Design a protein around this ligand. Sequence first.
Ligand SMILES: CN[C@@H]1[C@@H](O)[C@@H](O[C@@H]2[C@@H](O)[C@H](O[C@H]3O[C@H]([C@@H](C)O)[C@@H](O)[C@H](O)[C@H]3N)[C@@H](N)C[C@H]2N)OC[C@]1(C)O
Ligand SMILES: [Mg+2]
Ligand SMILES: [Mg+2]
Ligand SMILES: [Mg+2]
Ligand SMILES: [Mg+2]
Ligand SMILES: [Mg+2]
Ligand SMILES: [Mg+2]
Ligand SMILES: [Mg+2]
Ligand SMILES: [Mg+2]
Ligand SMILES: [Mg+2]
Ligand SMILES: [Mg+2]
Ligand SMILES: [Mg+2]
Ligand SMILES: [Mg+2]
Ligand SMILES: [Mg+2]
Ligand SMILES: [Mg+2]
Ligand SMILES: [Mg+2]
Ligand SMILES: [Mg+2]
Ligand SMILES: [Mg+2]
Ligand SMILES: [Mg+2]
Ligand SMILES: [Mg+2]
Ligand SMILES: [Mg+2]
Ligand SMILES: [Mg+2]
Ligand SMILES: [Mg+2]
Ligand SMILES: [Mg+2]
Ligand SMILES: [Mg+2]
Ligand SMILES: [Mg+2]
Ligand SMILES: [Mg+2]
Ligand SMILES: [Mg+2]
Ligand SMILES: [Mg+2]
Ligand SMILES: [Mg+2]
Ligand SMILES: [Mg+2]
Ligand SMILES: [Mg+2]
Ligand SMILES: [Mg+2]
Ligand SMILES: [Mg+2]
Ligand SMILES: [Mg+2]
Ligand SMILES: [Mg+2]
Ligand SMILES: [Mg+2]
Ligand SMILES: [Mg+2]
Ligand SMILES: [Mg+2]
Ligand SMILES: [Mg+2]
Ligand SMILES: [Mg+2]
Ligand SMILES: [Zn+2]
Lengths: 71, 42, 111
Amino acid sequence: KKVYTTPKKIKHKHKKVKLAVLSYYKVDAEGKVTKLRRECSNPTCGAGVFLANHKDRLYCGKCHSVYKVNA
Amino acid sequence: GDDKKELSAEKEAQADAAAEIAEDAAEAEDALNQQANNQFNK
Amino acid sequence: IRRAAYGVVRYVMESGAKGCEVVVSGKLRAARAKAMKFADGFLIHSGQPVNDFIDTATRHVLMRQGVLGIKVKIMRDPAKSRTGPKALPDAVTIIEPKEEEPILAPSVKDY
RNA sequence: ACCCACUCGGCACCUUACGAGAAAUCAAAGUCUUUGGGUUCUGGGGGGAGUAUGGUCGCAAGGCUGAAACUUAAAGGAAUUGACGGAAGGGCACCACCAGGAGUGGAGCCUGCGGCUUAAUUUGACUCAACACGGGGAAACUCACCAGGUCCAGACACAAUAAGGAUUGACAGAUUGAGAGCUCUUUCUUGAUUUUGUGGGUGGUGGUGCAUGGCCGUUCUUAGUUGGUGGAGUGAUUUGUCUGCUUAAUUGCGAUAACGAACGAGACCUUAACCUACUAAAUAGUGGUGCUAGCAUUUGCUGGUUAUCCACUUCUUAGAGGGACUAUCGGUUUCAAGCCGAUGGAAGUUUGAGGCAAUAACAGGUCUGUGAUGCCCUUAGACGUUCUGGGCCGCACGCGCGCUACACUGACGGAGCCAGCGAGUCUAACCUUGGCCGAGAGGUCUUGGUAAUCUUGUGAAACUCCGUCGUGCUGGGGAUAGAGCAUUGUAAUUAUUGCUCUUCAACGAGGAAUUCCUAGUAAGCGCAAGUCAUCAGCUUGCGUUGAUUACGUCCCUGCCCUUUGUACACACC
Ligand SMILES: CN[C@@H]1[C@@H](O)[C@@H](O[C@@H]2[C@@H](O)[C@H](O[C@H]3O[C@H]([C@@H](C)O)[C@@H](O)[C@H](O)[C@H]3N)[C@@H](N)C[C@H]2N)OC[C@]1(C)O
Ligand SMILES: [Mg+2]
Ligand SMILES: [Mg+2]
Ligand SMILES: [Mg+2]
Ligand SMILES: [Mg+2]
Ligand SMILES: [Mg+2]
Ligand SMILES: [Mg+2]
Ligand SMILES: [Mg+2]
Ligand SMILES: [Mg+2]
Ligand SMILES: [Mg+2]
Ligand SMILES: [Mg+2]
Ligand SMILES: [Mg+2]
Ligand SMILES: [Mg+2]
Ligand SMILES: [Mg+2]
Ligand SMILES: [Mg+2]
Ligand SMILES: [Mg+2]
Ligand SMILES: [Mg+2]
Ligand SMILES: [Mg+2]
Ligand SMILES: [Mg+2]
Ligand SMILES: [Mg+2]
Ligand SMILES: [Mg+2]
Ligand SMILES: [Mg+2]
Ligand SMILES: [Mg+2]
Ligand SMILES: [Mg+2]
Ligand SMILES: [Mg+2]
Ligand SMILES: [Mg+2]
Ligand SMILES: [Mg+2]
Ligand SMILES: [Mg+2]
Ligand SMILES: [Mg+2]
Ligand SMILES: [Mg+2]
Ligand SMILES: [Mg+2]
Ligand SMILES: [Mg+2]
Ligand SMILES: [Mg+2]
Ligand SMILES: [Mg+2]
Ligand SMILES: [Mg+2]
Ligand SMILES: [Mg+2]
Ligand SMILES: [Mg+2]
Ligand SMILES: [Mg+2]
Ligand SMILES: [Mg+2]
Ligand SMILES: [Mg+2]
Ligand SMILES: [Mg+2]
Ligand SMILES: [Zn+2]
């Protein structure tokens, strides 16, 4: 046939990091628990799901994308 | 196949035809789902 | 090859066919393909009596080496037709007339 | 000299063949394993080789005599069937010619093919039997090519990873042609469905039509193929299957060691021609009668009218029948199958036209129709697939199928006005009458039709008539090009198509060549169907107009058939 070609630089795919992280809640002394990172307002999110914190952005990931709640 | 054996061709072929008549002649004579969702709906 | 084919011919001949034909095409065990006709008895080819009296199939048999064609032709008894013409358009039957015991003295009958 | 008969001895010939032979053949090649008249000589698988060496003869060239080493399984005879001939003899054919028709070949454009070009210009096919072929009219699709971007749709098994997360997704920005979370940034989400590797799969218009099936083309517009019993032969085989005559035909007659038969041709099937009779039709029409319009007429003519009734089946439709068998008569011949002529007839070229189609052949075409297929290739930076955009149309040129023209048997303008085969729409946009808008192209409101019911009498075109042009590259011709307006489609640029003005080329009948054709044919002409969103200079069918000239030959060409030769049989590649 032809047998190869192309400039250089194969592309990579993705990770999903590592993240031991679903520990974001704060317990005071014995035992009271207060939540970090405010949860989400859509009827598809039972407010067990939270909103990512960037800048401007807070965003719902259980909705795979949808919605912009910005506080 | 080769022309040397052609007799044993015709004889075993004759013999294959008799066994289709024997198999033939003998054969002329011879010898819920949704409801389990409803009853489990408790 | 010939065993199976000959045996199929003799079973269809046994079955009261006017005649039958088995064609094997393709390649058996050798590089170069071949074709073998196996016929017995009476068959016809041209014309509408084909459409009435002969059923043909072809079948692709797919083997470790390759693919063989099998085209089986069977000519049923026309006299047994039971729906269709009962003979070939070729058939012409005269009726065997009689031996006459000749003449008489003329006379007459009365009733 | 000649004739006839006879007889020795000759050169030959003819027929047999009792006999012999592997056979072709042979009065010897016979008088044979029933093996013996006399005698001379030669040969003992094929090569090496008539070579080496010695002897001998020769002026010489060469003669006579004449080994071996080594090598090899066939070489050789006669005959058979095939096959093949730059051999002959017969036949057949408008894919051959004669007599002619219209052309093609020239020109412009249309198209395919080569070539060049190109990131790419995807690829098959190359005499007839490649080149308006792959149903191949490609804007994306198609699509196989090229420039880039995504996705797994990587079954299943084992391993490993891993609930402290195997893995999935994504907003904004970045990025990207792109409102692709491709990838990055950021940090939520998901929950054992994946991920990683091995093994194994899967897909591939990737390869091989020279591994195959299936199909198809071609030999073949052909006429050939086989077997029973009997004859010939040791045999394979042969006769049958043939000189002649006849046919479209191994179609028949006839000749006959053959007789009597089978596949193929024929028959058969479909379709077109004819049925004052069969059975019927508001989904076909006819006459009558009402209702009624217009002319003129004391009447009569022409329309109109989905039922207003009554009758009928000529014309239209399709069931089942019938009819042609070359019939009758006369010619002509083997005194034959046939052939020519006449009359009749719907029809007498197998009535016209087709479908089907024996044995075999080909390295014909096709893995680019197939979830037909072997093997090879590839399979995650994919040859899988999708998306974006180009390409298949690219232009010094060579070739093939065509379309349009060179005009006065015409163009243009009125006017006349006639077909046949077709096809059409429910999750849908098909065929479209009518009504208005528009120079057009088209637009728009309605409508009939799943259809002998509506479009549709598809009011097609050539053609007919009355005029304008008047032989002037002209009012013939319309390539090229500009500007504008519409239609299909997401998308019209390299201009899908359509329309109006303008632009107004070559072409003054086409060299060497070469195609097709015999009667409702050739030729002119349009239509529908296929492709199909749009696009036909293409194809498949259809009807409209409708001739000249053959009713022969074997000169050319092509093929079939005898014979003939062969050392070919993997068959003249
Ligand atoms: C004017 N625009 C178009 C016009 O060009 C024409 O187009 C048709 C086209 O649609 C047809 O398309 C075809 O498609 C169907 C379908 C079943 O495949 C066919 O049955 C039928 O031949 C035809 N209707 C084509 N065959 C002919 C053109 N004149 O007619 C339809 C139209 C929409 O009016
Ligand atoms: Mg084959
Ligand atoms: Mg026939
Ligand atoms: Mg003499
Ligand atoms: Mg020797
Ligand atoms: Mg031909
Ligand atoms: Mg020619
Ligand atoms: Mg001529
Ligand atoms: Mg030309
Ligand atoms: Mg090209
Ligand atoms: Mg062609
Ligand atoms: Mg092309
Ligand atoms: Mg593409
Ligand atoms: Mg591909
Ligand atoms: Mg794997
Ligand atoms: Mg081939
Ligand atoms: Mg064929
Ligand atoms: Mg015999
Ligand atoms: Mg026959
Ligand atoms: Mg009336
Ligand atoms: Mg009638
Ligand atoms: Mg006569
Ligand atoms: Mg080839
Ligand atoms: Mg195929
Ligand atoms: Mg393949
Ligand atoms: Mg394939
Ligand atoms: Mg193709
Ligand atoms: Mg290919
Ligand atoms: Mg296909
Ligand atoms: Mg198949
Ligand atoms: Mg060419
Ligand atoms: Mg062609
Ligand atoms: Mg006119
Ligand atoms: Mg009608
Ligand atoms: Mg009509
Ligand atoms: Mg002019
Ligand atoms: Mg003009
Ligand atoms: Mg197009
Ligand atoms: Mg075409
Ligand atoms: Mg003649
Ligand atoms: Mg040669
Ligand atoms: Zn949300």
